[PDB]
């Protein structure tokens, strides 16, 4: 499994937005959470999520705290409801990638079966195009072990809903 | 004079998602939100309970974890699915609802049918026990009734939803 494409369930977009809005998230501040679904295939399917408690220092990007116990404890409970919806990565409200993201990403590698997906949900909705960007971390050992470079690979994504949600979405807009 | 239950975007989608996932089995979860005036119940969010086939430790675990992320709302009732069996309360359900009503008189039992629910029609109802014991001391019969259902979305949620295709 070398990833190529990503689908997002409308419920995840709404969950990220609701998470953002309910935490009175101030300007310059971001909310962060866990995404769930399927990432064993070339197309990654993001079908669920949950919110994380997360703190970072606005004046020093090297300092942030993710509650590892919280990830595991909440993940435990998710498996008891749907064992098919696995931990596949994380999300935040961005709007852009931050300096700590490569390192936060590393921590999620402990919880995922494959290379973690980072999903940025633009909760300000100012692009007017798609309010999501999908990233995967890649590293390349260039020049034979004098240096390696690590960066985020942008994956195209699309909003895809299963029937149950299709019905919900149309009911809400109509 | 009619009391309405206002169900949010995510609460609706979670209920439908969880109902469909459980087919052919019934599923269940708790509804979170708030009671306002006599005519208004808001269901802001929901969470699934594990297949028992009402775990207190799971519930308390979830409530405490949700509160750490700004989901502070009280339990205002519960939902369950009737995959292909329409909307009603069994005698086990009445008993379940009875325990919810000992905590909040205005507690609501939502029932969804994920099989009959189809594009253009969500098969769903909200129930509350009929008041008996208006003549019981403190020291031909229907057991429940329906409440009207409606839906709420913020303007932001509305803009978000436009992105589905």
């Amino acid at each position: 499994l070398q990833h190529e494409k990503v689908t997002i369930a409308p419920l995840v977009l709404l969950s990220a937005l609701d998470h953002y809005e309910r935490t009175q998230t101030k300007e310059n501040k971001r909310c962060v959470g866990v995404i769930l679904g399927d990432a064993n295939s070339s197309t990654i399917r993001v079908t669920n999520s949950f919110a994380l408690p997360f703190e970072e220092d606005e004046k020093n990007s090297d300092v942030w705290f993710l509650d590892h116990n919280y990830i595991e404890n909440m993940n435990e409970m998710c498996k008891k409801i749907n064992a098919k919806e696995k931990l596949i990565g994380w999300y935040h409200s961005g709007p852009k990638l931050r300096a700590s993201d490569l390192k936060i990403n590393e921590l999620f590698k402990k919880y995922t079966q494959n290379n973690p997906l980072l999903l940025i949900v633009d909760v300000k909705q100012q692009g007017v195009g798609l309010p999501t960007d999908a990233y995967v971390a890649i590293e390349q050992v260039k020049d034979d072990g004098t240096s390696t470079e690590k960066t985020f690979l942008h994956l195209p994504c699309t909003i895809e809903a299963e029937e149950a949600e299709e019905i919900g979405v149309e009911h809400l807009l109509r | 004079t009619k009391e309405t239950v206002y169900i949010s975007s995510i609460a609706l989608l979670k209920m439908l998602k969880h109902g469909r996932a459980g087919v052919p089995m019934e599923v269940m979860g708790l509804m979170l939100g708030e009671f306002v005036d006599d005519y208004t119940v808001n269901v802001v969010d929901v969470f699934a309970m594990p297949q028992s086939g009402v775990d207190d430790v799971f519930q308390a675990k979830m409530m405490d974890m949700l509160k750490q992320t700004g989901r502070d709302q009280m339990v205002v009732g519960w939902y369950h699915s009737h995959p292909g069996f329409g909307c009603w309360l069994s005698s086990v359900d009445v008993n379940t609802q009875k325990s919810f009503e000992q905590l909040n008189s205005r507690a609501v039992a939502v029932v969804v049918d994920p099989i009959q629910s189809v594009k253009g029609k969500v098969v769903i109802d909200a129930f509350r026990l009929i008041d008996t014991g208006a003549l019981i001391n403190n020291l031909l019969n229907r057991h429940y009734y329906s409440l009207n259902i409606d839906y709420h979305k913020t303007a932001k949620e509305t803009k978000m939803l436009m992105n589905l295709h």
Partner: nanobody
Amino acid sequence: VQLQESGGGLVPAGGSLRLSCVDSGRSTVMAWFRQAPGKEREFVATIRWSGGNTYYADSVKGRFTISRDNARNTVYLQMNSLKPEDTAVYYCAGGTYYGTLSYKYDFWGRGTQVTVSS
């Protein structure tokens, strides 16, 4: 900015104030919230434009009255028997959610300062 608050200012403990909020570009629900320094925004009162159903925070019941005037696109808060703990910036908000959760409102006014003397 769609919502415009007015009234309010310094008032002595026990006195009265009337807040008004004008909506310039027509939501089904209006509310007042308030925020003091170091505290979270706190729900005060909510009202339906059509019908006029009202709901109040417990700390404000029987002292404050939220009303609306449909013709003039205006919502009021009559604040009586004021106390030092009522000191805050008062905001009106509109939306379609009838309740207490600030984040379920769609738009806000810039706010008006209310000060009750200790």
